[PDB]
Design an enzyme around this catalytic site. Structure first.
Site, PDB file in Angstrom:
ATOM      1  N   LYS A  14       0.820  -1.371   0.064  1.00  0.00           N
ATOM      2  CA  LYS A  14       0.128   0.062   0.019  1.00  0.00           C
ATOM      3  C   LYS A  14       0.748   1.245   0.072  1.00  0.00           C
ATOM      4  O   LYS A  14       0.537   2.152  -0.707  1.00  0.00           O
ATOM      5  CB  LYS A  14      -0.950   0.198   1.269  1.00  0.00           C
ATOM      6  CG  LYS A  14      -2.019  -0.992   1.155  1.00  0.00           C
ATOM      7  CD  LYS A  14      -2.947  -0.744   2.440  1.00  0.00           C
ATOM      8  CE  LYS A  14      -2.497  -0.551   3.797  1.00  0.00           C
ATOM      9  NZ  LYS A  14      -1.541  -1.888   4.262  1.00  0.00           N
ATOM     10  N   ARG A  90     -10.480   1.885  10.035  1.00  0.00           N
ATOM     11  CA  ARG A  90     -10.043   0.638  10.597  1.00  0.00           C
ATOM     12  C   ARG A  90     -11.078  -0.597  10.598  1.00  0.00           C
ATOM     13  O   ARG A  90     -10.550  -1.653  10.605  1.00  0.00           O
ATOM     14  CB  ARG A  90      -9.363   0.700  11.804  1.00  0.00           C
ATOM     15  CG  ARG A  90      -8.560  -0.332  12.348  1.00  0.00           C
ATOM     16  CD  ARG A  90      -7.858  -0.084  13.603  1.00  0.00           C
ATOM     17  NE  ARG A  90      -7.840   1.266  14.455  1.00  0.00           N
ATOM     18  CZ  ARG A  90      -8.991   1.683  15.273  1.00  0.00           C
ATOM     19  NH1 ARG A  90     -10.012   0.578  15.688  1.00  0.00           N
ATOM     20  NH2 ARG A  90      -9.104   2.621  15.686  1.00  0.00           N
ATOM     21  N   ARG A 129      12.468 -10.580   8.563  1.00  0.00           N
ATOM     22  CA  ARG A 129      13.804  -9.576   9.120  1.00  0.00           C
ATOM     23  C   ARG A 129      14.285 -10.312  10.120  1.00  0.00           C
ATOM     24  O   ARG A 129      13.908 -10.733  10.995  1.00  0.00           O
ATOM     25  CB  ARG A 129      13.024  -8.291   9.542  1.00  0.00           C
ATOM     26  CG  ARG A 129      14.233  -7.481   9.932  1.00  0.00           C
ATOM     27  CD  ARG A 129      14.925  -6.996   8.542  1.00  0.00           C
ATOM     28  NE  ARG A 129      14.150  -6.553   7.416  1.00  0.00           N
ATOM     29  CZ  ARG A 129      14.666  -6.316   6.191  1.00  0.00           C
ATOM     30  NH1 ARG A 129      15.951  -6.158   6.205  1.00  0.00           N
ATOM     31  NH2 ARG A 129      13.956  -5.961   5.337  1.00  0.00           N
ATOM     32  N   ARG A 157      13.695  -8.918  15.818  1.00  0.00           N
ATOM     33  CA  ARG A 157      12.918  -7.960  16.886  1.00  0.00           C
ATOM     34  C   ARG A 157      11.501  -8.900  17.162  1.00  0.00           C
ATOM     35  O   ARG A 157      11.019  -9.553  16.249  1.00  0.00           O
ATOM     36  CB  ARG A 157      12.683  -6.803  16.085  1.00  0.00           C
ATOM     37  CG  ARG A 157      13.922  -6.036  15.648  1.00  0.00           C
ATOM     38  CD  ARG A 157      14.591  -5.438  16.834  1.00  0.00           C
ATOM     39  NE  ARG A 157      15.799  -4.648  16.410  1.00  0.00           N
ATOM     40  CZ  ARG A 157      16.840  -4.782  16.993  1.00  0.00           C
ATOM     41  NH1 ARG A 157      17.098  -5.321  18.008  1.00  0.00           N
ATOM     42  NH2 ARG A 157      18.249  -4.268  16.491  1.00  0.00           N
ATOM     43  N   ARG A 168      -1.063  -9.951  13.996  1.00  0.00           N
ATOM     44  CA  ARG A 168      -1.456  -8.698  13.494  1.00  0.00           C
ATOM     45  C   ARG A 168      -2.125  -8.848  12.119  1.00  0.00           C
ATOM     46  O   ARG A 168      -3.015  -8.326  11.742  1.00  0.00           O
ATOM     47  CB  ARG A 168      -0.035  -8.015  13.137  1.00  0.00           C
ATOM     48  CG  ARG A 168      -0.031  -6.591  12.363  1.00  0.00           C
ATOM     49  CD  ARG A 168       1.372  -5.952  11.795  1.00  0.00           C
ATOM     50  NE  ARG A 168       1.027  -4.611  10.985  1.00  0.00           N
ATOM     51  CZ  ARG A 168       1.899  -4.128  10.372  1.00  0.00           C
ATOM     52  NH1 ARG A 168       3.090  -4.739  10.134  1.00  0.00           N
ATOM     53  NH2 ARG A 168       1.766  -2.678  10.015  1.00  0.00           N
TER      54      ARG A 168
END
Length: 213
Positions: A14, A90, A129, A157, A168
Protein backbone atom coordinates in the site's frame (compact mmCIF):
# COMPACT_ATOMS: atom_id res chain seq x y z
CA UNK A 1 -9.84 14.96 -8.83
CA UNK A 2 -10.83 11.55 -7.43
CA UNK A 3 -12.17 10.47 -3.99
CA UNK A 4 -10.58 7.15 -3.11
CA UNK A 5 -9.70 4.65 -0.37
CA UNK A 6 -6.82 2.22 -0.54
CA UNK A 7 -6.93 -1.01 1.44
CA UNK A 8 -4.69 -4.02 1.89
CA UNK A 9 -3.13 -6.10 4.61
CA UNK A 10 0.23 -5.16 6.13
CA UNK A 11 2.97 -5.95 3.66
CA UNK A 12 0.70 -5.79 0.62
CA UNK A 13 2.53 -2.76 -0.87
CA UNK A 14 0.00 0.00 0.00
CA UNK A 15 2.63 2.56 0.95
CA UNK A 16 4.52 2.19 -2.32
CA UNK A 17 1.44 2.15 -4.49
CA UNK A 18 -0.08 5.08 -2.61
CA UNK A 19 3.03 7.15 -3.42
CA UNK A 20 2.84 6.16 -7.09
CA UNK A 21 -0.86 7.06 -7.16
CA UNK A 22 -0.09 10.53 -5.79
CA UNK A 23 2.72 11.13 -8.25
CA UNK A 24 0.50 10.33 -11.23
CA UNK A 25 -3.00 11.40 -10.16
CA UNK A 26 -2.19 14.20 -7.67
CA UNK A 27 -4.75 13.25 -5.06
CA UNK A 28 -3.89 13.87 -1.38
CA UNK A 29 -2.63 10.64 0.23
CA UNK A 30 -4.01 10.66 3.80
CA UNK A 31 -2.92 7.92 6.17
CA UNK A 32 -4.19 7.60 9.74
CA UNK A 33 -0.71 8.68 10.88
CA UNK A 34 -0.95 11.72 8.64
CA UNK A 35 -4.38 12.75 9.93
CA UNK A 36 -3.37 12.42 13.59
CA UNK A 37 -0.12 14.24 13.02
CA UNK A 38 -1.86 17.10 11.28
CA UNK A 39 -4.55 17.33 13.96
CA UNK A 40 -1.94 17.59 16.69
CA UNK A 41 0.34 19.95 14.70
CA UNK A 42 -2.64 22.26 13.96
CA UNK A 43 -3.82 22.03 17.59
CA UNK A 44 -7.33 21.24 16.50
CA UNK A 45 -10.20 20.28 18.84
CA UNK A 46 -9.67 16.61 18.20
CA UNK A 47 -5.91 16.88 17.89
CA UNK A 48 -5.46 18.14 21.43
CA UNK A 49 -7.72 15.29 22.66
CA UNK A 50 -5.78 12.67 20.68
CA UNK A 51 -2.52 14.08 22.13
CA UNK A 52 -3.98 13.67 25.60
CA UNK A 53 -4.54 9.91 25.04
CA UNK A 54 -1.32 9.36 23.09
CA UNK A 55 0.78 11.07 25.77
CA UNK A 56 -0.51 8.44 28.27
CA UNK A 57 0.10 5.47 25.94
CA UNK A 58 -3.66 4.98 25.44
CA UNK A 59 -5.50 3.96 22.28
CA UNK A 60 -7.60 6.91 21.01
CA UNK A 61 -11.44 6.52 21.21
CA UNK A 62 -13.46 6.38 18.04
CA UNK A 63 -15.28 9.68 18.74
CA UNK A 64 -11.90 11.39 18.54
CA UNK A 65 -10.60 9.36 15.59
CA UNK A 66 -13.78 9.90 13.58
CA UNK A 67 -13.65 13.60 14.51
CA UNK A 68 -10.06 13.89 13.24
CA UNK A 69 -11.18 12.47 9.93
CA UNK A 70 -14.05 14.93 9.68
CA UNK A 71 -11.55 17.77 10.35
CA UNK A 72 -9.21 16.44 7.66
CA UNK A 73 -11.89 15.99 5.02
CA UNK A 74 -13.15 19.54 5.67
CA UNK A 75 -9.82 21.08 4.51
CA UNK A 76 -9.57 23.04 1.25
CA UNK A 77 -7.31 20.50 -0.57
CA UNK A 78 -10.00 17.82 -0.44
CA UNK A 79 -12.55 19.21 -2.84
CA UNK A 80 -9.73 20.62 -4.99
CA UNK A 81 -7.48 17.62 -5.52
CA UNK A 82 -9.42 14.69 -4.10
CA UNK A 83 -7.80 12.16 -1.79
CA UNK A 84 -6.57 8.63 -1.11
CA UNK A 85 -7.51 7.57 2.38
CA UNK A 86 -5.20 4.86 3.78
CA UNK A 87 -5.65 3.09 7.10
CA UNK A 88 -9.03 4.61 8.01
CA UNK A 89 -11.51 3.26 8.29
CA UNK A 90 -10.01 0.53 10.53
CA UNK A 91 -13.32 -1.14 11.33
CA UNK A 92 -16.88 -1.35 10.09
CA UNK A 93 -17.91 1.10 12.82
CA UNK A 94 -15.41 3.58 11.45
CA UNK A 95 -16.64 2.94 7.90
CA UNK A 96 -20.23 3.76 9.00
CA UNK A 97 -18.83 6.95 10.59
CA UNK A 98 -16.86 7.85 7.44
CA UNK A 99 -19.97 7.39 5.32
CA UNK A 100 -21.87 9.84 7.61
CA UNK A 101 -18.94 12.25 7.43
CA UNK A 102 -18.83 12.10 3.68
CA UNK A 103 -22.58 12.54 3.28
CA UNK A 104 -22.61 15.59 5.59
CA UNK A 105 -19.78 17.21 3.60
CA UNK A 106 -21.46 16.32 0.32
CA UNK A 107 -18.50 14.19 -0.87
CA UNK A 108 -19.01 10.95 -2.86
CA UNK A 109 -16.52 8.08 -2.63
CA UNK A 110 -15.60 7.11 -6.21
CA UNK A 111 -13.47 3.99 -5.76
CA UNK A 112 -11.42 1.69 -3.54
CA UNK A 113 -8.07 0.15 -4.51
CA UNK A 114 -8.01 -3.16 -2.64
CA UNK A 115 -4.59 -4.77 -2.90
CA UNK A 116 -4.93 -8.53 -2.23
CA UNK A 117 -2.07 -10.80 -1.25
CA UNK A 118 -2.45 -14.27 0.25
CA UNK A 119 -2.12 -13.82 4.02
CA UNK A 120 -0.08 -17.04 4.39
CA UNK A 121 2.40 -15.53 1.91
CA UNK A 122 2.36 -12.26 3.81
CA UNK A 123 3.22 -14.16 7.03
CA UNK A 124 6.44 -15.38 5.37
CA UNK A 125 7.35 -11.90 4.04
CA UNK A 126 6.61 -9.99 7.24
CA UNK A 127 8.39 -12.46 9.44
CA UNK A 128 11.60 -12.47 7.39
CA UNK A 129 13.68 -9.63 8.93
CA UNK A 130 16.70 -11.02 10.77
CA UNK A 131 19.57 -9.35 12.62
CA UNK A 132 23.10 -10.79 12.76
CA UNK A 133 23.88 -11.81 16.34
CA UNK A 134 27.47 -10.50 16.16
CA UNK A 135 27.33 -6.84 16.10
CA UNK A 136 26.36 -5.48 12.75
CA UNK A 137 23.67 -6.20 10.22
CA UNK A 138 20.05 -6.55 9.04
CA UNK A 139 19.02 -9.14 6.41
CA UNK A 140 15.76 -10.71 5.26
CA UNK A 141 14.92 -14.41 4.72
CA UNK A 142 12.94 -13.62 1.59
CA UNK A 143 14.31 -10.36 0.18
CA UNK A 144 17.94 -10.32 1.20
CA UNK A 145 19.44 -13.60 2.57
CA UNK A 146 22.89 -13.37 4.15
CA UNK A 147 25.96 -15.32 3.05
CA UNK A 148 25.25 -18.81 3.34
CA UNK A 149 22.55 -18.48 6.04
CA UNK A 150 21.87 -20.55 9.12
CA UNK A 151 19.20 -19.47 11.63
CA UNK A 152 21.38 -19.64 14.71
CA UNK A 153 23.45 -16.74 13.46
CA UNK A 154 20.49 -14.31 13.73
CA UNK A 155 17.80 -13.09 16.02
CA UNK A 156 14.63 -11.12 15.46
CA UNK A 157 12.89 -8.07 16.83
CA UNK A 158 9.68 -8.99 18.64
CA UNK A 159 7.43 -7.43 16.00
CA UNK A 160 9.06 -9.52 13.26
CA UNK A 161 8.57 -12.91 14.86
CA UNK A 162 6.07 -15.22 13.19
CA UNK A 163 3.69 -15.42 16.16
CA UNK A 164 3.54 -11.60 16.48
CA UNK A 165 3.02 -11.20 12.72
CA UNK A 166 0.25 -13.82 12.76
CA UNK A 167 -1.58 -11.82 15.45
CA UNK A 168 -1.28 -8.65 13.36
CA UNK A 169 -2.54 -10.32 10.21
CA UNK A 170 -5.42 -11.95 12.14
CA UNK A 171 -6.66 -8.62 13.47
CA UNK A 172 -6.42 -6.89 10.10
CA UNK A 173 -8.24 -9.76 8.37
CA UNK A 174 -10.99 -9.74 11.02
CA UNK A 175 -11.41 -5.97 11.02
CA UNK A 176 -10.90 -5.40 7.26
CA UNK A 177 -13.12 -8.07 5.74
CA UNK A 178 -16.43 -6.50 6.85
CA UNK A 179 -15.31 -3.13 5.49
CA UNK A 180 -14.34 -4.62 2.11
CA UNK A 181 -17.71 -6.43 1.95
CA UNK A 182 -19.60 -3.26 2.98
CA UNK A 183 -18.18 -1.31 -0.01
CA UNK A 184 -18.06 -4.26 -2.40
CA UNK A 185 -21.85 -4.45 -2.11
CA UNK A 186 -21.87 -0.94 -3.71
CA UNK A 187 -19.43 -1.84 -6.48
CA UNK A 188 -16.73 0.43 -5.17
CA UNK A 189 -14.06 -2.22 -4.53
CA UNK A 190 -11.48 -2.93 -7.25
CA UNK A 191 -9.35 -5.96 -6.34
CA UNK A 192 -5.71 -5.60 -7.34
CA UNK A 193 -3.43 -8.59 -7.61
CA UNK A 194 -0.71 -7.67 -5.18
CA UNK A 195 1.05 -10.88 -6.54
CA UNK A 196 3.36 -8.95 -9.01
CA UNK A 197 6.33 -6.47 -9.47
CA UNK A 198 5.77 -2.87 -8.30
CA UNK A 199 5.20 -1.52 -11.79
CA UNK A 200 2.79 -4.34 -12.78
CA UNK A 201 0.65 -3.72 -9.66
CA UNK A 202 0.69 -0.06 -10.54
CA UNK A 203 -0.28 -0.76 -14.17
CA UNK A 204 -3.38 -2.61 -12.92
CA UNK A 205 -4.19 0.31 -10.63
CA UNK A 206 -3.84 2.77 -13.49
CA UNK A 207 -6.29 0.68 -15.59
CA UNK A 208 -8.76 1.00 -12.70
CA UNK A 209 -8.33 4.71 -11.93
CA UNK A 210 -8.14 6.05 -15.50
CA UNK A 211 -11.33 4.22 -16.40
CA UNK A 212 -13.38 5.33 -13.42
CA UNK A 213 -14.84 8.53 -14.90
Amino acid sequence: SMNLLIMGLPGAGKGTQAAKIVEQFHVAHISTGDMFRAAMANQTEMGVLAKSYIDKGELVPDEVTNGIVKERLSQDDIKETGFLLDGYPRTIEQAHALDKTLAELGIELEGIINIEVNPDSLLERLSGRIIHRVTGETFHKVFNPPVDYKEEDYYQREDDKPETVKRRLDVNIAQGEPIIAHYRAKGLVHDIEGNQDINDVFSDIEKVLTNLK
